[PDB]
């Protein structure tokens, strides 16, 4: 219902005021009603890729449309690059097969080119990546793209803005029920 939906938001407001950080974002994710930009942003910077994909998965799947396909590919690209940078070529190959391979069907050559970064001494030998700066510069610069990709995604375009309402509305409405457990 539309009733149920707007109750979610009230509850959300409450949790945030009770400093229940985790519970807030599990709700956002499971309800799919509000995508917390500033939360997403923070998680990207931290390199929490398992959580990042998990939170996204509450709002869209990898193959839903063209926007979210690139959003995912982009994350699983950076994940693979950092793996490469810390020279953990084991985790890279794992990433390559489990995470990046689903995008090969669409782009067979691109996948081969991503696979060949494994043999380079430093993947910045590849000219298209010679500008990749470090972990921190690269995540933020990727984050910028992601904000755009999300805000242009139709599945998100109605969910990014938290409807503004009075401080502690849920406590006040509960108070109206007490004026009117049990």
């Amino acid at each position: 219902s539309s009733l149920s939906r707007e109750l979610v938001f009230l509850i959300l407001q409450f949790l945030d005021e009770e400093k229940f950080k985790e519970t807030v974002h599990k709700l956002e994710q499971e309800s799919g009603f509000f995508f917390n930009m500033k939360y997403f942003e923070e998680k990207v910077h931290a390199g929490e890729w398992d959580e990042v994909e998990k939170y996204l998965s509450g709002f869209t799947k990898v193959d839903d449309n063209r926007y979210s396909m690139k959003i995912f590919f982009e994350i699983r690209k950076q994940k693979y690059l950092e793996a490469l940078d810390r020279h953990d070529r084991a985790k890279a190959v794992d990433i390559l097969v489990k995470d990046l391979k689903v995008f090969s069907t669409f782009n067979e050559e691109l996948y081969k080119e991503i696979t060949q970064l494994l043999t380079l001494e430093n993947f910045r030998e590849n000219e298209q990546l010679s500008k990749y700066g470090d972990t921190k510069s690269a995540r933020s610069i990727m984050l910028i793209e992601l904000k755009k990709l999300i805000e242009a995604n139709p599945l998100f375009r109605e969910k990014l803005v938290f409807p503004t309402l009075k401080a502690s509305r849920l406590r006040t409405l509960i108070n109206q029920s007490a004026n009117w457990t049990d």
């Binding site: 063209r66 926007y67 396909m69 690139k70 590919f73 690209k77 995008f103 669409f106 782009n107 691109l110 080119e113 991503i114 590849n126 298209q128 990546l129 500008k131 755009k148 990709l149 242009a152």
Partner: peptide
Amino acid sequence: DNLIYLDLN
């Protein structure tokens, strides 16, 4: 001003 094909850069 946006461009959503898949590549390295």
